[PDB]
């Protein structure tokens, strides 16, 4: 997963996270595996939206992707009855992921070293070996 539960419980108040999680567990006591599973599902969502033009086991993780995983995990964790703002922000992050997949916006870099994640060649052409090109310094 892109973001750990210790970050989702920091961006979103831990008490509200416990309130959301405690029903979903089998026993009925505050649990941590539910949040990790939701974060894994959100990371899978982002991975699917990024694999279009990136090598998906990201060499360097864009620093905004932690936020983009936390928001989607929060929406996935409020599926029974979400606030209007949660839905609006989830639609905004889906729009951002669609723009990233299309090519309108790059995901960003790692804020530590400003390195952008690599990916496979979106465009690739092959032609026959070049003959009579200007690089052939013979003749002329």
């Amino acid at each position: 997963n892109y973001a750990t539960v210790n970050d989702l419980c920091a961006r979103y108040t831990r008490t509200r996270l416990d309130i959301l999680t405690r029903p979903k567990t089998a026993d009925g006591q505050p649990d941590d595996a539910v949040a990790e599973q939701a974060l894994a599902d959100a990371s899978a969502f982002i991975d699917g939206y990024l694999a279009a033009r990136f090598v998906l086991p990201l060499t360097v993780v864009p620093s905004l992707l932690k936020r983009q995983c936390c928001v989607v995990a929060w929406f996935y964790l409020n599926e029974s009855q979400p606030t209007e703002q949660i839905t609006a922000t989830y639609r905004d992050t889906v729009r951002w992921l669609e723009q990233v997949r299309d090519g309108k916006t790059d995901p960003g870099v790692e804020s530590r070293t400003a390195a952008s994640p690599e990916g496979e060649d979106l465009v690739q052409v092959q032609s026959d070996p070049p003959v009579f090109s200007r690089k052939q310094k013979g003749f002329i």
Partner: protein
Amino acid sequence: GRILDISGQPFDFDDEMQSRSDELAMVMKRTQEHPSSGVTPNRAAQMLRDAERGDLTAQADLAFDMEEKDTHL
């Protein structure tokens, strides 16, 4: 017996053919390179310059291929 050539240098004349000298048996039998397969002007210039420097093998093979390939030629 010491026959002189046109340039007036005496020598001994031998009936044995120079190729059939039991020393050039592995250099008189060469399988041709056929260098005219996929020639690029750069490589043609390279073989021409090699021939100019003294190694005439590539030029001769290229000429043979040009003779047998280009019908008008």
